[PDB]
Symmetry: D2
Subunit: 464 residues, 4 copies
Amino acid sequence: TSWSDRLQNAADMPANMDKHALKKYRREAYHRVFVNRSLAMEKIKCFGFNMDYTLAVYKSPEYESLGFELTVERLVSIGYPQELLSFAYDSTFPTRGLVFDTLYGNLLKVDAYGNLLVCAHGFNFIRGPETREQYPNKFIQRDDTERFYILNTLFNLPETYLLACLVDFFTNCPRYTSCETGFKDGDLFMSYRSMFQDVRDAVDWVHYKGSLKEKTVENLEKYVVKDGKLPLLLSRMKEVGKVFLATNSDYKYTDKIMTYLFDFPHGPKPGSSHRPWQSYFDLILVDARKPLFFGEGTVLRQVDTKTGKLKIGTYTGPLQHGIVYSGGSSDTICDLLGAKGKDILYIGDHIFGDILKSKKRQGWRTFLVIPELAQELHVWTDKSSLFEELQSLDIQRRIKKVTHDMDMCYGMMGSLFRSGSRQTLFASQVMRYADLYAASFINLLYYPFSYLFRAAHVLMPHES
Amino acid sequence: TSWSDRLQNAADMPANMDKHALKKYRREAYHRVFVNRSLAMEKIKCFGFNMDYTLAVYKSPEYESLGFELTVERLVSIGYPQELLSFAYDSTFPTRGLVFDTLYGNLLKVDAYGNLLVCAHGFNFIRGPETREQYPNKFIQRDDTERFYILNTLFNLPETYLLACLVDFFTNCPRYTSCETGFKDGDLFMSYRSMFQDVRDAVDWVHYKGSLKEKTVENLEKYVVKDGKLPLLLSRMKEVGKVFLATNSDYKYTDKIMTYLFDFPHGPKPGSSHRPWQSYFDLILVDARKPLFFGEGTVLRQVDTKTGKLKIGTYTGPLQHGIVYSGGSSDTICDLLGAKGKDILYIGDHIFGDILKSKKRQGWRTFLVIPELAQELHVWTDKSSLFEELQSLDIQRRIKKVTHDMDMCYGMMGSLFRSGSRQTLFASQVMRYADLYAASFINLLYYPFSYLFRAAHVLMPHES
Amino acid sequence: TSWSDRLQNAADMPANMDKHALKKYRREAYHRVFVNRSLAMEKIKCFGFNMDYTLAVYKSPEYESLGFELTVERLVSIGYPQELLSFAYDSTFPTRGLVFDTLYGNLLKVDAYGNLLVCAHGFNFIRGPETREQYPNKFIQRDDTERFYILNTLFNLPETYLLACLVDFFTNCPRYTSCETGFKDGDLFMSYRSMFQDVRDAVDWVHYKGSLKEKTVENLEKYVVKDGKLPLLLSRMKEVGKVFLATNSDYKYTDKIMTYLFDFPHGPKPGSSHRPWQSYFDLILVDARKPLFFGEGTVLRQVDTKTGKLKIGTYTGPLQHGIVYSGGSSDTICDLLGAKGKDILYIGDHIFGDILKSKKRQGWRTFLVIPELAQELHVWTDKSSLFEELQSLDIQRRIKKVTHDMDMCYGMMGSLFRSGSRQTLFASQVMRYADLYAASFINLLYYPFSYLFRAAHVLMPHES
Amino acid sequence: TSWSDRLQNAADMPANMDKHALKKYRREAYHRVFVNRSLAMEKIKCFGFNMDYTLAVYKSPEYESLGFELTVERLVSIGYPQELLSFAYDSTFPTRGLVFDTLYGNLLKVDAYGNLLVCAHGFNFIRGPETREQYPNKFIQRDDTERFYILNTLFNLPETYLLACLVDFFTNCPRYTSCETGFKDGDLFMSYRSMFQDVRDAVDWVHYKGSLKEKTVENLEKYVVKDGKLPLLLSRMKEVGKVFLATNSDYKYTDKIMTYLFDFPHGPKPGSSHRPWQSYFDLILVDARKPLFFGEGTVLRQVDTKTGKLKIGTYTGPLQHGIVYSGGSSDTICDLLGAKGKDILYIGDHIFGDILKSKKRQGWRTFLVIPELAQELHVWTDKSSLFEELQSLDIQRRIKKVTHDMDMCYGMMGSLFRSGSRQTLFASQVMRYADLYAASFINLLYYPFSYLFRAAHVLMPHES
């Protein structure tokens, strides 16, 4: 059962908007919105969205496997060995948020302070004492971005697994000699760093010059979750405020995806006339170039929605009905919608490019969609006995074993949010920058128009 | 009663090292070490120190007033008007950690997300609605370091007050015309930014070319707290590990200050022979240039301790008894003491340059000394009824009034750690980067050699 | 008669290697090598080449017109108006080396000191007094590379004309309003700068993602000059030294072009067996990335010449027979050929990326190929009476008229080397950085193996 | 006979302003203005000056020796060995414009292309073949400013000699071991680079915090050339245009120096009333911060000429009589004097900071003062037989000997302008960027108000 199976199962349900049903529905962990900082929904005047893995939730593991296959094909096309074609995407290996160390070719799971929680070289998991040879303080400086790449996004899940596949392959292939920082093949030396660069280049190519989008839009039922409650929630948001889209994708792809997301024989509710997806938005902006978008951005352009090309020139006019923007900056949104940052709830899936940056640079309110939570919540509740035992032991060898047993329930790289009793960097960033979070933003449907999301005030140790 | 009065009162007490007395002493809030993250003291192999406001605690408000007077004199010397000489340092106005906005000339108290908690233009406190003209989202981007300067250090306390004095003076002096971003005097325009730059320049000059150090070392009993328990604690640290000094100050000043700090007719305990301050340290390093020290640092030099000058050349030798280093980097300490970062407890007063940077760049364990806590703890316990009422009301106009009444007990700029129920940026940084903290590191004396400092594990909302 | 007609006419001639014929041939201006600094050919141990417009001389105006058409088609494809399709390349307008001012949309011909010699807005040539409104000192700061782009290369000739076409078109099209820095079309504003950026982007796209190379290699007799004396000269160079190729082009294109350049039924001389082009080179390097090549360069790779793809890994081996390199740096050449810079004569057509940079960064000896000189020499000798009259007048209105009459013989933008008696920036750079220069490097064939190219010593005014 | 003796000898002469005497006087090489590019004096509307070594010509070798002594004293004060005190400035060693190579500790004389003409390690002159070990191509990349420092200014003459003294001293002192890149003293290693940095720091300190200015202004007759014709020339310039001062020095020093330069019992001519130096200038600007001055500069300030301090604020007013400016940019001059660049003749001694930068960045006309030419002209004419023989030989061992014999007449580092028949970088920069040049700008006195300075037009080799 993948997290997208859970999402699609809930997506298939019709909305029962009886007040008592909603209040009961939201109490269930899977339909709940979780709260890091208090947020009064009545103060929100604009609801903003990205598209990928928020509105358009790509099905798992089908989409990751497609991106993996095309990335492998691209690497082989540029001269990587044929054996790469025998790889096959394995969703049980990668957890999101791992750090690839380009010096030693390791995938690392770290806490918020750069402490090592898991270390794998290829598919070999390196235990604590053996990591000290390469990591004498069991620690990395995360912000050394020349050395470390943090595989933060759901789009990074295939390349997370591919990196481990490649290290595994070159390590065990007799044509190559394993060295500390790469692989030697006679008069050729491939460092883990140049390997990583090829992989990054190939992933980028697949998404922006290859056939990934084309293969996606030709079989949208295979690749994209569809939920009839999406138009209902957006229509209700538009009754009490403004709704905008700000996506890094271009207009042609956005139009294809959004048209599918709204392709029902009805509008917001069953029995209502169907409405075009654009009608649900007060402002539509593509080619956003987040996170640069939240600083100086790029020049504001207008999409010719007939041809899908940009009109020539910087757009200097006002917000018009039916206009579609390209580029610009977050100030564009604020000026055109007459909003200040704390009036905006921005709903995204990119912990860095959507949530961290809109919070820190603009003071927007933030809703982080975490698709894997749809399944991790089930593992967390089903295996709570493991965690509680671990808590009790905390109050050594038994600790490591329960930690391992708990973690393996999530996959070979453990929970997105912890390893045993130790929280991941990703978990710490969710708590710090996401005001609200959930497996899907659809869970906002089950809360009244002026709900007060509440979180406990924080006290320092000397204040307790 | 200043915080240094509290510190000096505790400093005057002799150490009762009876186990039961210590356990009772540490229970009292004023002699306690507070814990943000668990720390097993038996794992610490090296204890590191800065000097200023950690070993050498400068008396308040005498030292701030001295630095204020010399800074004013420097500004007048370069052509600021004579009326500056009528200013007098007022310790009730500044709270540490305020942000000077060089665009509009305001001192701001903000939370961790850049939200405005207090705004003062000169000595005029600007209420919420009036701040929206300059701060439409009641928000600043803290990391716009061209515009905002965060007055983070105890050395910044005089210039915090001086900035408000200057804005107040120019605003109310008839020779000048107040403008949005500065003051006009006929054909001269002084922006708040250039004013701020002059003040910064003058503070730097006073500390490094003026008479501040000279005036300090000629009356050390007036300006520096002295505690006979300092040699005792350091001697006990040296019994179980290594002890090092890493200060930004130069050797001549360090020697004068440290000699005074150890100038008792005895050594670690009464009745013992006096020992030179250097004998308490396995490694002494001056001109550290933190925070650069925790990255590439500077070249390692050797101090000629006879002349107080640097020997010519990069020092390439080993750790020798009696050698004093200059410059280098944190890797110097680790290599020479054979330590890894998590073996080190570094004790400092600079939330950024000592604690944040040693944690994030090197994974050192951290102890933050917060001198003002020595008094803020008394206000917190004496006025707990105010905070509890505020907590109860949280569960509008009454809220603002109790908030104001609570805050004014700390000074015109409120507590270092909060305004009402809202935590400051400074408080959030203490919690995030200081593993331990206290009004003085001397409180470590009251804990056994292998104490386990404990903090509760953190859980995400969906895990609760 | 284009300069490539002249080159092809000389290329059709067989080589008469009788000593007396050669000495007579080289005396003629069209077959001469011109000398800025003395160079003893016997000291040259390596002869280096780029490919484009040196070995592969593209025919004019056919090649410029092809690149122009494809660039226009690309701009229309991205949304420029259909009227662009009515443009047609006009070789009489552009002279190489003009500066496009992106602020005011002008093409400028300047001297070495940034003084304006010619100014055209579209096809309107702006006389001296009218240029002072935009250029108060009749001067530009050439190195303000954010504002000025110097159209230095033969590849820039189509975009030189296209920029003037576009300014002309938008200026005279009623849908647009002309402004100081661009064109307004209702709520769209296209600055000359963003227009220029589109043009640059389109030129780059045409060369590296469009069909330019494909259209070139499918009709090489139309697009590329072919000379049976090329293998003869290279074979004679290899008898007395080493020969290398260092091109920015990739291997697949280089192989197609070079195979055509050597496709005769004979080798170096008529009657000799044909030899593959690679056999003429001691070292072959593609993807050179000049000018970066002459600093740190890029990592050295090996071309798999069977597949045309790069082998995986950095190449760490020695110079091997038949190996083809990719990337690297100029130090690669020096180390593998055992040469120092002054042992190398590097023959190129890029005044900046080939000649200036190899001279200034490495002290290579330099030979600049200037294809247009093949025709400009004819204009210079045929119209010498105009220049001599101008010289005599110099020793006002008559001066301007003779200047105009002289310049128009070269085209609407005058000689590459001067306007009247004033030398261009390009001329000054040739003299400063090109040790030798000629319309074709083939003119080296007509000089003996150890010729001493001589230039007069320079004296300062006070030394004369 | 130093060049300042020559200057002072001519300075002692009264001005004979009879037209025929002037025309005869200017024909003599020593009173001539030399011309690199034609300049019509009637087009000049503003005459601009720096002060140091233009208006205030410091006497040689007294001033160099003073700066040398104070720099040595500063180095000893910071811990360099006592033997430095036995050094004594020797004007026969340094020639201006040498390059210190901080990697290998050599002084190099180079041509415009970075080719080695002279190489000295300490006082050991390294012959051609031996330089190839460190300089395999007998070539340096001058613009590698991390490695090479070009000792361009007359202020650099003492540190040129001091660098050679230090390398010589450490090389021959038994306490130190000579290494390729520095000196080892047990556990200390001093690289030539850190040595160079100390020297630079000490020179800067001596000029801006030490006693150099103080010692200069207390004995101005010893240290500064004085010429009664200076007020005459400036007064005549003011009759036909505007006159401005733009100096890097501060106002207090400028006032002391300029007051001395004008301290005669008369004004422009004998018998006329004395006038204050300021009255000779339409615009006075100090703290210019050239070369930054010729780009964005610094904010414009006003000097309070009563106190010598800056008024507080940016000066926003107009040009007023008696106002003195500080900072600003070259656009300040142009706007306030209503001038364009080619209307300005700027007279300076800094080949880079005055002449190169005003030419390249602003298109100013330029006059370079070269004080040493006052003597080098005498050597050039007295030893012309040596140069002519060298010219004849050029048309091997005899060549080297005549080259050495010629060069030694100028000093151990040869002529500022050449070594034998090879021109220096400095000579090439004079020709390229100085429109006019002379040993003193006073030679402009001997030319009529609207003289046309003429230089021959330049022709390319193919145009001859």
